[PDB]
């Protein structure tokens, strides 16, 4: 009473699925590029970074580790990938 | 008396309150320099205070105006006015609500806030 061709499932259903319960297990997290206020330095960081990453030149913390996702420090201009 | 934010604490800092006025005061002898005893006001903590100093002291003016209108409504045996207090430098907006009482006495009423302290530390 639950019909779906698993050969070609919905991308919405795969996105709502668990990360390993996907048809191909892939990672759900990603990376980011940030621009600091102190030096405008673009830095690549993890979306789920367990470390409080700072900028290189200005010692300005970019993100804070909290459980699942990393919480960015305020006033940092970011981009996906 | 009622106001949309709760009155936290009303306190006297009068020199005669601490028993050190130069004269012991006389009813209706308003020409004394120590006639108007200072009374500090504090209301309840609101997370919506104006975070600018002039808007903040003018909101203090508005709350004192609300006290003045309600006292002129329901306490008509007392007299009241506003005196532009300026005794602290570079603040050009202080208003002391001066109350005259038919027991022959008079007081100043002025608002204090944690927001005043936090903006002074910001300064």
């Amino acid at each position: 009473v639950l019909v779906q061709d698993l050969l070609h499932p919905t991308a919405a259903s795969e996105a709502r699925k668990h990360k390993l319960k996907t048809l191909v297990q892939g990672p759900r997290s990603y990376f980011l590029d940030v621009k600091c206020p102190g030096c405008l330095n673009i830095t690549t960081v993890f979306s789920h970074a367990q470390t409080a990453v700072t900028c290189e030149s200005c010692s300005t913390i970019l993100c804070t580790p909290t459980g699942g996702k990393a919480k960015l420090s305020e006033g940092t201009s970011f981009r996906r990938k | 008396m009622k106001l949309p934010l709760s009155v936290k604490s009303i306190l006297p800092v009068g020199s005669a309150f601490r028993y050190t006025s130069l004269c012991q005061p006389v009813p209706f002898a308003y020409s004394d320099p120590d006639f108007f005893q200072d009374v500090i006001l504090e209301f309840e903590t609101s997370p919506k205070w104006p975070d600018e100093i002039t808007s903040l002291e003018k909101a203090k003016t508005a709350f004192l105006l609300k006290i003045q209108e309600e006292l002129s409504a329901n306490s008509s045996t007392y007299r009241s006015f506003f005196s532009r207090d300026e005794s602290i430098p570079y603040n050009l907006e202080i208003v002391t609500l001066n109350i005259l009482t038919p027991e022959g006495y008079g007081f100043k009423f002025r608002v204090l806030t944690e927001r005043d302290e936090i903006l002074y530390l910001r300064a």
């Binding site: 590029d33 621009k35 206020p37 102190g38 300005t60 960015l72 420090s73 305020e74 006033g75 940092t76 201009s77 970011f78 981009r79 | 975070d51």
Partner: protein
């Protein structure tokens, strides 16, 4: 409040981070200060 929490994006693809109930860009720069 509008210009602070109005979903600012830069010229290059870069969006800033803004917390809840935060109200001034001058205040954000003062936090950085």
């Amino acid at each position: 409040q509008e210009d602070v929490q109005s979903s600012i994006v830069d010229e290059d693809g870069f969006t800033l981070v803004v917390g809840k109930n935060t109200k001034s860009l001058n205040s954000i720069r003062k936090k950085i200060l």
